C-alpha cells in the first residue's frame with residue numbers, strides 16, 4: 001500500500017563538445033518519476049556503458065537533452081508480463097539511474113547467463129562491441145585462417161575481441177595500442193605482436209617488422225594518419241574493415257590528409273565500412289552464443305575498466321576517449 | 334640509309350604541374366638489328382594520366398614511358414615481318430628496336446573504317462579499364478544509377494556508354510560546357526560542369542535525387558569526398574584513378590569522412606586494367622569493337638600532330654584540354 005518516490009538522475013549535454021569533451025559539457029539533472037501505468041516497467045540501472053560513438057552522435061542531440069547510451073538494468077516494478085520484476089534487461093535508456101519503459105526497445109539478456117560472468121559483459125565482449133568485432137572480422141574481413149590481421153585500438157573493447165577471435169581462427173595478429181601496459185596485456189592474451197603507436201620510431205617500420213609479407217586484413221578502429229600508413233603495408237587485394245575512426249572524432253570538421261590513391265589502386269585494396277546492427281535475428285544470436293562459449297572456454301579473455309558511480313559517468317567517457325581504459329569502459333551505478 | 338630515332342626524356346621530375354622545360358628531346362642513330370629483333374616506327378603515341386605518377390620512378394634523363402601503335406620497318410624475327418602493326422610499350426620514341434617479347438598484335442579483324450589509334454583508347458587499355466571497372470568492380474546488372482567523373486575523357490566516355498547499353502541511369506561530370514553538351518548528345522541522362530556549378534552537392538542531388546548505386550572514380554580528391562554523402566546504402570565505389578591529386582601526391586587534401594563510409598556501409602575498391610588477362614581480356618576487346626561498330630559506343634580522339642608536340646599533348650590532357658582520348662600522330 002505505501003508509495004515511495006523514485007528519484008531518477010540523468011546526465012544531460014549542457015554544451016556541445018569543442019575538441020575534447022570536458023566535465024562542463026555535462027549537467028546532472030534529477031526528475032521525480034510518475035507511477036507505472038498498465039504495460040509499463042520501472043528500471044534501475046546496474047551497469048552503464050560509455051562508447052566512442054557518443055562523441056559523434058552527441059552532435060545530433062539538442063543541448064539539454066539526456067546523453068545517449070545502452071545500459072544493463074533490473075526491473076524493480078512491473079505491470080508488463082513479458083518483463084517480470086527482478087528480470088535483467090538491456091536498454092537504450094541513456095545516461096540515467098532509473099527509467100520507465102513500456103517494453104519497446106528492451107532486450108532480454110542472453111538466456112542461460114552464467115552466475116560467474118558479471119552482467120556488464122552484456123555491454124562489451126558478450127555485447128555490441130564483441131558483435132562488432134565478430135562480424136567485422138569474420139564477415140567484412142572474412143578471415144578463414146592463415147591470414148595476418150592488423151587491429152588498431154587493440155586493447156580496447158572491440159580490438160581485444162578482434163585479436164582473440166583472429167587467433168582462435170588460426171590467424172597471425174598484430175595489434176596497436178596507446179600504452180606499454182596495453183602492449184604487455186596484448187602479448188599476454190595471445191597477440192603475435194603489438195606495439196605502442198605513440199612511442200614508435202617509425203610506424204611504417206614497426207608495421208613492416210611485425211609482418212614483412214604484409215597484411216591480408218586491417219580492422220580499422222582509428223582511421224586518420226594511422227590508416228594512411230597501413231595502406232602501404234597491405235597485401236594485394238587486401239581488405240580493410242572500416243569499423244571506426246576515433247583519431248578524428250574531435251576534429252571531424254578539419255580532417256587530416258587522406259589515403260594515398262597509389263596504394264589503393266595498384267594494390268587493388270578493398271575498403272569497407274560497416275555497423276553492428278546490420279546483423280540481426282538468428283545470425284546475431286548465434287554470434288552472441290559463440291562469444292559466450294568462447295569466453296567460457298577461455299578462448300576470449302576479458303578485462304573491464306570499471307568506473308564506480310553514476311555521478312562519475314562523464315569522467316569515464318572522457319577518459320575512455322583519452323585512452324585510460326584497458327578493455328570495456330563500464331560505469332557501475 | 335641509317336635511321337635516327339628521337340626520344341622525349343624526363344629532364345627533371347615534375348613539381349606540381351609539368352611544364353615544357355621538364356622534357357628534353359634526344360636524337361641517336363640506331364645500330365643495326367641483331368637476330369630476333371625488329372625495328373619499329375611509331376604511328377600513334379599515347380599520352381596518359383598515369384605517366385604523371387609513374388614518372389617519379391624514372392631516373393632523370395630516361396625516356397618517358399608509354400604505349401604506341403607502331404609498324405615494323407625492318408625485321409629479323411619471324412613472328413613480326415616487315416609491314417606488321419603492333420602495340421608496343423616502347424615509350425616516347427619515333428623509332429624502337431625490340432626483341433619481340435613485349436609486342437602485342439592488334440585484334441585480328443581490325444576494320445579499316447576504324448583508325449588504328451583506337452587501339453590505344455576505346456578499343457584499348459582505357460576502354461578495357463572502363464569495361465572491367467564498370468562491369469566487374471561496380472558490377473552493374475541493369476537499373477542502377479551510375480556516376481562517372483572525367484565523363485568526357487577516354488575512360489569516362491566508355492563507362493557512360495557501356496552503362497547506358499546495360500540499362501543503367503548515367504550521370505557524368507566534366508570541366509567544360511563543350512564536354513557537357515557532348516555527353517548529353519552521346520546518351521548520358523544527366524551531366525554537369527563541376528567547375529561552374531554553384532554547389533557540387535546540389536548538382537549531384539539534382540542529377541539523381543535518390544542517390545548513386547556506383548561511382549566510377551577517375552578524379553578522387555575533394556570531388557570524391559562529396560560524392561560519398563550522395564551514395565545509397567551499400568553503394569560501390571570503383572577507385573579507377575585520382576587525377577585530382579596527381580600534381581599533389583605528397584600534399585594530399587582532407588580525406589573522406591568515416592561517417593559516410595561507416596553509416597552508409599560503403600565499399601570502396603581500387604583496380605588496375607591489368608588484372609584481367611587471357612580469354613576474358615580478348616573477349617572484352619571484341620565486345621568493345623562490336624559496340625563501336627554497332628554505334629552503341631561513340632568515340633572522339635583529341636589528336637595532336639607531330640612527335641615534337643608530345644610533351645604539350647601530355648600537359649594539355651592533364652589540364653583537361655582533351656575531349657576523348659589524347660593521341661599523338663608521329
Ligand SMILES: NC(=O)c1ccc[n+]([C@@H]2O[C@H](COP(=O)([O-])OP(=O)(O)OC[C@H]3O[C@@H](n4cnc5c(N)ncnc54)[C@H](OP(=O)(O)O)[C@@H]3O)[C@@H](O)[C@H]2O)c1
Pocket residue numbers: 051052053128129132153154155156157158159176177178179182221222242243244245246247248274275276277320321322323324325327328329595
Ligand atoms: N561500426 C560499428 O558498428 C562500431 C561499433 C562499436 C564501435 N565502433 C568503433 O570501434 C572503435 C573501438 O570502440 P570501442 O568501444 O572498442 O572503444 P575502446 O577502443 O574501448 O576505447 C576507445 C580507445 O580508442 C583509443 N584512442 C583514443 N584516441 C585515439 C587516437 N587519437 N588515436 C588512436 N587511438 C585512440 C584509446 O586507446 P589507446 O590507448 O590504444 O589509444 C581508447 O581506449 C571506435 O572507433 C568505435 O567508434 C564501431
Ligand SMILES: NC(=O)c1ccc[n+]([C@@H]2O[C@H](COP(=O)([O-])OP(=O)(O)OC[C@H]3O[C@@H](n4cnc5c(N)ncnc54)[C@H](OP(=O)(O)O)[C@@H]3O)[C@@H](O)[C@H]2O)c1
Pocket residue numbers: 265381382383458459462483484485486487488489506507508509512551552572573574575576577578604605606607650651652653654655657658659
Ligand atoms: N586503374 C587503371 O587501370 C586505370 C587505367 C587507365 C586510367 N586510369 C585513370 O582513369 C582516369 C581517366 O584516364 P583517361 O586516360 O581516361 O584520361 P582522360 O579522362 O582522357 O584525361 C584526364 C582528364 O581528367 C580531367 N582532370 C584533370 N585534372 C582534373 C582535376 N583536378 N579535377 C577533375 N578532373 C580533372 C580532365 O578532364 P575535365 O575537363 O573533365 O577536367 C582531363 O581531360 C585517370 O585518373 C587515370 O589515371 C586508371
